[PDB]
Design a protein around this nucleic acid. Sequence first.
RNA 1: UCUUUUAUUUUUUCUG
Lengths: 49, 112, 114, 262, 133, 30, 63, 177, 447, 49, 56, 196, 56, 65
Amino acid sequence: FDMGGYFIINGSEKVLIAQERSAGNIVQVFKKAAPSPISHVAEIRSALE
Amino acid sequence: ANWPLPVNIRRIIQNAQQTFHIDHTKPSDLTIKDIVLGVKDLQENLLVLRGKNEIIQNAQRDAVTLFCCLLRSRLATRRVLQEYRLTKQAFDWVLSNIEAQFLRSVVHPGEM
Amino acid sequence: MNAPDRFELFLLGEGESKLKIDPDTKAPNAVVITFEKEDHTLGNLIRAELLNDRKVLFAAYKVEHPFFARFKLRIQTTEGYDPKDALKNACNSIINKLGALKTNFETEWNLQTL
Amino acid sequence: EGPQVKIREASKDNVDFILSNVDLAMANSLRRVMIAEIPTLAIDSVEVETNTTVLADEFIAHRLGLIPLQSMDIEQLEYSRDCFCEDHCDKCSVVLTLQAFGESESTTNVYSKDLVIVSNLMGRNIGHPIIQDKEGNGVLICKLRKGQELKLTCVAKKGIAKEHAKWGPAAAIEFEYDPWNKLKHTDYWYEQDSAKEWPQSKNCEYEDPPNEGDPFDYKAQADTFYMNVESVGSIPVDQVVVRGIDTLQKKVASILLALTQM
Amino acid sequence: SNTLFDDIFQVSEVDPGRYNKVCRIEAASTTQDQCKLTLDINVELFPVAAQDSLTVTIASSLTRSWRPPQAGDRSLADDYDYVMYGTAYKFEEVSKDLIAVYYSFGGLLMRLEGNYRNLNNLKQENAYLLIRR
Amino acid sequence: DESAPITAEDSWAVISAFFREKGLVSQQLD
Amino acid sequence: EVALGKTVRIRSAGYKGQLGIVKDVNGDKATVELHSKNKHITIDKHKLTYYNREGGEGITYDE
Amino acid sequence: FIVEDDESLGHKELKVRKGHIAKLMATEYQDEYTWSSLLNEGLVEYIDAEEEESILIAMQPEDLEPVDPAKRIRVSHHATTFTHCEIHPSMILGVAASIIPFPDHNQSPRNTYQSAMGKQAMGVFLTNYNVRMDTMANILYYPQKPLGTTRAMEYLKFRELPAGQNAIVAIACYSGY
Amino acid sequence: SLHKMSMMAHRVKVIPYSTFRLNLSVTSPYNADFDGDEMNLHVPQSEETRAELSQLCAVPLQIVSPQSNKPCMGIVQDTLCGIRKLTLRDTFIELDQVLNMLYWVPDWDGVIPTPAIIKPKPLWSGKQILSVAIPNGIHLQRFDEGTTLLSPKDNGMLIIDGQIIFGVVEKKTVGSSNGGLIHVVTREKGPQVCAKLFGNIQKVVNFWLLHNGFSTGIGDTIADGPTMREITETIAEAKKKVLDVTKEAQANLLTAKHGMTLRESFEDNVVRFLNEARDKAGRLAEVNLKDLNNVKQMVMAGSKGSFINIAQMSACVGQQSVEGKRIAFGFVDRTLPHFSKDDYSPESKGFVENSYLRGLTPQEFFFHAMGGREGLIDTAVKTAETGYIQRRLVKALEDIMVHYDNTTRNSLGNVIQFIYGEDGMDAAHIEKQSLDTIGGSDAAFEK
Amino acid sequence: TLSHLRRTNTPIGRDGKLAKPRQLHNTHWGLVCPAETPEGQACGLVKNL
Amino acid sequence: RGNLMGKRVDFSARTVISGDPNLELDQVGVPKSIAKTLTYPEVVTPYNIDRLTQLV
Amino acid sequence: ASRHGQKGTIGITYRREDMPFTAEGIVPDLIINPHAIPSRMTVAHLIECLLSKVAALSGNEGDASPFTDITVEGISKLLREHGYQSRGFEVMYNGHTGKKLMAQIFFGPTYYQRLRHMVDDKIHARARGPMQVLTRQPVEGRSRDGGLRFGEMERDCMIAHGAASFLKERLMEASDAFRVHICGICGLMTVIAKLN
Amino acid sequence: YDRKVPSPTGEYVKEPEWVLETDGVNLSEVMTVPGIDPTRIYTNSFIDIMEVLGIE
Amino acid sequence: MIVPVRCFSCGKVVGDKWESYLNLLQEDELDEGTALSRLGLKRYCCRRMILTHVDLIEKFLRYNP
RNA sequence: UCUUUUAUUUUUUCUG
Ligand SMILES: [Mg+2]
Ligand SMILES: [Zn+2]
Ligand SMILES: [Zn+2]
Ligand SMILES: [Zn+2]
């Protein structure tokens, strides 16, 4: 019934949890607050596969 | 008209009536001069600030202003005679316990 | 770790008595009787019997707390008629009437063939 | 005469009857002492010689305690606490030995029949494991591989269900009264019609239906107690009722004895 | 320790008013034109019908722990069907002539409206109300 | 018959196929 | 003392038939941990029976 | 599920059919046709969050493509341009949320609290607890499967390894405790 | 420990079991459940400290709260529901149960009250049986909606000499209220007598409820057929009217509300109609529910549940709001994949057509999950913000104390209030009161 | 076991603060369990498939 | 903040709470084990010498 | 805890004898307060109880998936056909006096779960066990025999209350008390005090 | 908004009133505009009220 | 693990009927309700006691020890 | 004739 998918380090069963993150190679625009001079800033997290 | 205030004149009057079994048929021995002197004496005995000087007396009258108005409104002579039928002993007991409950309701010094 | 002893639900402890009568100043000819190591099984029975007994003015029962197997029964009766005698009469009535129930059950089983 | 009993039907494990001319307090108190305070025999202590099986021996001992045991002559048995002995005796305890070694490759089921008495009963029909299945095997106890061993001893002593439900002689005890609500002792919840939305109990056929025209019979009292006792098997359903009445009588007599001594 | 009031009222209306074991009955006295009654009676034990004449009396008798009858031949007002105990809690005046006495028989509320003839009725805890058909 | 419409009760068979051939930890293993 | 750290049984108490192990003695009374339940109980030693390490012959408090 | 016309006889219909269902059943009771085969023949399509933008998904395999008062009110089909269909909307719940009987019939934070409490619910984690040596393990004496079972449990193995027990409950205030 | 009453001294009772058993009216000041909550017990180590704990920190002494001059401690869940049941007019008690409850009262006077019914059957009214718990000399009088001295619906209350005269008892009588029975008893007789009254009322009502019974089941949530049809009609006409407003909006013939743009105007308007429809369905369901209905009985007792809760359970869950607005367009111009875009229908943007009994659609279930998570995260943030705020407030007002001049001063001695509360009156001794002078016309004032 | 194996973790700071990602955005449908989550500081950030 | 404004305490216990309507308002049930654990030191007097002798 | 968010700890362990019983001999294993259900808006618990009762009366396994044709009306009809009150109610009796309860109790099987939170693991009292070395105070935590932390909130409520001697005895006598010698001039704890 | 104002008869009676609300805080110039009642002007903000109408 | 020998709700013996229940389900090929009724469990408490059991001794045994 | 130990910190998990 145990479906596996975990490591055993020093006999302790260890599971790696999926780390959610912003997708790579995408252009996203965000509106910025009035006090900052920046407005409508675009960001891209460029990444090689 | 509804505001927080220390002691319920209405409730103490009901307690007086129940305790003394006030007979509504029989006339009341109270006299208007006795009523007015009783209310004035109670108002004088209503002390929350105690200190013999003009500033403290003004402060005490200031503190007990609203409650003085409520006492006059409730134990007015017309209300005491017509709406209420308290006897002399009942009125005296009411005044004594109004004074007592005010003097309990005073802040207990040392409150944080 | 500290649950109550099961045997203490019905066995008397050291320095303890089954019955403790105390008269009450509350009303005349009135006693409160504490039964130790008992449940409502006797309580309802005895209370109902006192109610059926026509001379008894008040009969009621009480568990202070479900934890302790103990319950109190207050009886007040008429002047001159002891609540102890009332309880004796009620218990004797229960003895006789349970005996009649037993006899009827024994005689009426044997009519069955299974 | 006192209360009247009428048994509608009888069985080895079920007895259904009607109690008439009896108080509701008595109907309860009889039911209560019957379901709680009848003395009965059951496995109290378990000594495990060896256990290689996959079940915790705590779990095994709990099971052996819950197993029914014959309690026909429980009256002739005496309480362990009042008895005096050295760890064991026939006058307050019954010793039962259970041995189970796997032989076959398939799983070897272990049953109540595997409990063999080793103490001297002295002629008291007590301690025989109860068997009711048509195969006669009895209650399943454990299961074993070929290589597994389970050897143990059991000391069963008199007790009542107040200590532990394993001493409980009676199973679900039925108590019903006034099936029709002539006394209006309950207010039936409904949405359109209580009579239509409530099942008609099987015992309403033994009472005349109410008449809407007539008024409420305020003099009426609770009577015609439809009871149905069922026994697990440790004691026949006859002596369930009879010894429930007997121990209620003994309890009231003990109250009288305490009263007299005080 | 005697009867204080007694009259004949013909029930004019019966209302359950979202209750089952108790109904409010509105009645007016046959003799006294200005006399009315609005009492809550337990129909669960004393069924009532509209346009039904009931005789109602109020007595002051027949501390003090209540006790059962204590005798098969106990003497009391044993010739009425439905007897009540309550306590007055209000004596109001309307129209300078009509006097309404409110009674509470353990939460069962009555308003007896009448005239000076009910002077015998006082504000005391002892207030037994007896009814028969 | 072979080309009849599917039903919601039949979708459970497809679900069972998913669970048999991938399983719950399938993404981690893969 | 020779009663410390030994296996023992109770014989008139609510916990009759309970094996246990002697842990500490305060004089006139010994504390024993029930071998079926999770509890320590205090009871006089003269009234308890002591056995050898292994189950078998039983002797009173006379070792 | 993929929703294309694939039917000159009339309206849209799911590509999967009773024949494919029967084949999947046959493969199931055998232990050739499985989810790999379904993917190859394009009966079921893998769809991500981004691709959900461009597709209109049908609620049920038959309710939307073409009354008891007690029945759930469902909004009638309005569009006739579906491209996919939900395999089963009950499959949006997670592991702990697939154990709740009738999640529709609950206020949502009370589904959340159950989904949190299922993790600490006692049961039977694995069948080799005696072989293993775990720091903290709890085993119910008598595990029992739910009387109100759910079809997701046959795949989640909750029936085989239950966590809880069926107890007779009376919703009442008896003694105030 | 968010407030003063969340730390009080009790009297120890030795009991063999492994939990702190506390009398259950006390859970209100501690804000405590029995869902795994943990509490501490601190033993004083000196007679000095046992003394100050006794006469300064005691459950009878913190009955009346300084926060809102009302009793923080009131009679609660089963006791409050069962006390409503007992003080229902049609509730009558047999001789046996009467006789018992008279003994269950500890400070029972000694005399069996005379019953209401005596000849047809000796029967005591529940009001009479509750009267014996209240000590003598306790007047009280409240007049609820349309209450007359011949109270038709048994609303309000009037107690004279510790004898209930009319009116059922609910949270407004015996719960936490400014002029409640608890408040008047603790003010007149005192804290000890009010604590005894809590005890006596709880024991009596618990006995009666144990011997009467009370429950709840799905039949309580179930409404009648005609009622369900009319609720369906209500939701249908609400949808029709929302669609009409929508068509007007697409036509631009709707006039934008002053101070709000067109989107916000339409959104607020439709939310208002949907809440109105849900609330009307709520009244219809509540009216259809009968007095036998356990959930209605419980709501009327005021123990737990509410009108909105009955409506949501049986009639309509209603619109789900996110960030104070309806369900937001998630992907592009849609809330979920099933809705063709720019479709402002109530179902599309969050409205629930189905009660919990009937069952929500899957999209409605997801919207409800959104609402639930938002409530949960809002609670998780709000508890921390309020805890920081309370810490800051107490640190700011730590040293302020009423010295013996009857003045409020900080540690340095600077005057902050020359007279505390502008009265010199303690908070726990204040009560709501009517001023007859300020009200009334000139003619009425003269008369 | 299965919940932990399918659990997902967001690297945003767990400290109590207003955050859009703590809500159940519409696109979470069918990819993230809308009911299962921890309650408390980690609520909304930890997600389960 | 950690070690002076508030700080750890002896002669105290914590545990789960339960409701008991059969207990007076001002009264709290205490587990027997917690009772045997915690103690309050009382000075000896001629008034309670016999009591304290029984307890010792 | 149930499978619907209904969590609670056992208040009292009443026997089969004392617990109320329906008119089929069946004494419930559990009782919950009906006050839980309206506020918690959990009709799923009641529906599950009805489905489980019908499942035990039929032998079938009652499907309870989120979106299924099965409805409360259908469950009630099945229970009706099986010979019970359609909505799951059952006339019960007072186990303590045999009186038929005036109300009708919603009865039936339902699935509950035991959680890891054991009072035996969660109970603890302190008797001057080990203390820290850095600050000379009661240690943290249960297993090492730690103490309870009279928090800033707790101190604050004591200030509100006014029990100054208690607050002293709690923060000085109970936690940590040290006598230190100082001198008038500088008033520092650097006095070489050879008390012997 | 309704407001309780005395009547010639001396009873408080409800009179309607056209009250202008605003989504901005600038009290100094507003309170000098003709036509309004500067006595009864109020601001949701309190810093401006302190700064112009005094500390009390 | 294995069948409770006594029903929790009332205490009627049910352990002895596990094998008979399995046989009625396997050889007789009869549904669970009729199987239970023939076994003699009339009360739903007992009926779910036997119906709902999951046999886990069959799973624990067939490990090597 | 008493005494007599239970490291520390970084993380994670949940509990109210
Ligand atoms: Mg809680
Ligand atoms: Zn012996
Ligand atoms: Zn110096
Ligand atoms: Zn059973």
